Ligand binder design. Structure first.
Ligand SMILES: [Zn+2]
Length: 258
């Protein structure tokens, strides 16, 4: 009986095992575009994914991750509200059973069809496990997905989903270029937050791009064909694996644009 997104183990139950679920800087949050403060002291983001080395794709039971080689500064994220260099370690999505929901972050209470999170850890802390234990250990780049035209660069990821249908399964997934999942513009919002899955640690600096990317109904539809369960167990479709918005409390959302 461990956490999940079902009725009995959903987000509204998480606080019982992870008391921090009711913390002061939890995520996601609703982004109010009229209360967000334009900070002109922010530098533009610097995304260097040219030497990115993907390695494996995996169904962990919660979402499917695409892992990268982070033994060196191959794919890094700097600039923006960040100090120091952050290494890309993995990216994953959050989607709904319908196109009217799926994103964790909301814009003016608006829900997108899904949300992509590229997870990075501050290289100053040596490794991921030490990073998560720091207030500025992680920097996550969030990207909203709306159903429309197809995103070519996402097709490779979609094709292999059949090979990682259930929890535990993983498949070699080399030579994938994450730059094909980026929108045209890098304008964003930023605020201090946390992971959106247990342990729900509050070590993340969120960077949520203003511009969403388009994916076809067919692409998002294949995500929903995934299972929460493991092979040989009753089938539970992997849908609605997003956490609802949390209280903003003592926090302000800064934008890099106006
Ligand atoms: Zn996530």
């Amino acid at each position: 009986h461990h956490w999940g997104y079902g009725k009995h183990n959903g987000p509204e139950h998480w606080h019982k095992d992870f008391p921090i679920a009711k913390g002061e800087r939890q995520s996601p949050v609703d982004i109010d575009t009229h209360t967000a403060k334009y900070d002109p002291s922010l530098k533009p983001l610097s995304v260097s994914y040219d030497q990115a080395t993907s390695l494996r794709i995996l169904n962990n039971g919660h979402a499917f991750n695409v892992e990268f080689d982070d033994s060196q500064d191959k794919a890094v994220l700097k600039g923006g509200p960040l100090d120091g260099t952050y290494r890309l370690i993995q990216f994953h999505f959050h989607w709904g059973s319908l196109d009217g929901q799926g994103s964790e972050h909301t814009v003016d209470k608006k829900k997108y069809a899904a949300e992509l999170h590229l997870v990075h850890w501050n290289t100053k802390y040596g490794d991921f496990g030490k990073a998560v234990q720091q207030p500025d250990g992680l920097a996550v780049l969030g990207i909203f997905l709306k159903v429309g035209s197809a995103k070519p660069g996402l097709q490779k990821v979609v094709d292999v989903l059949d090979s990682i249908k259930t929890k535990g399964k993983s498949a070699d997934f080399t030579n994938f270029d994450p730059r094909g999942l980026l929108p045209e513009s890098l304008d964003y919002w930023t605020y201090p937050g946390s992971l959106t899955t247990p342990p729900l640690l509050e070590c993340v600096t969120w960077i949520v791009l203003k511009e969403p990317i388009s994916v076809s109904s067919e692409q998002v539809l294949k995500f929903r064909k995934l299972n929460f369960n493991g092979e040989g167990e009753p089938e539970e479709l992997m849908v609605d694996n997003w956490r609802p918005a949390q209280p903003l409390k003592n926090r302000q959302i800064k934008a890099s644009f106006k």
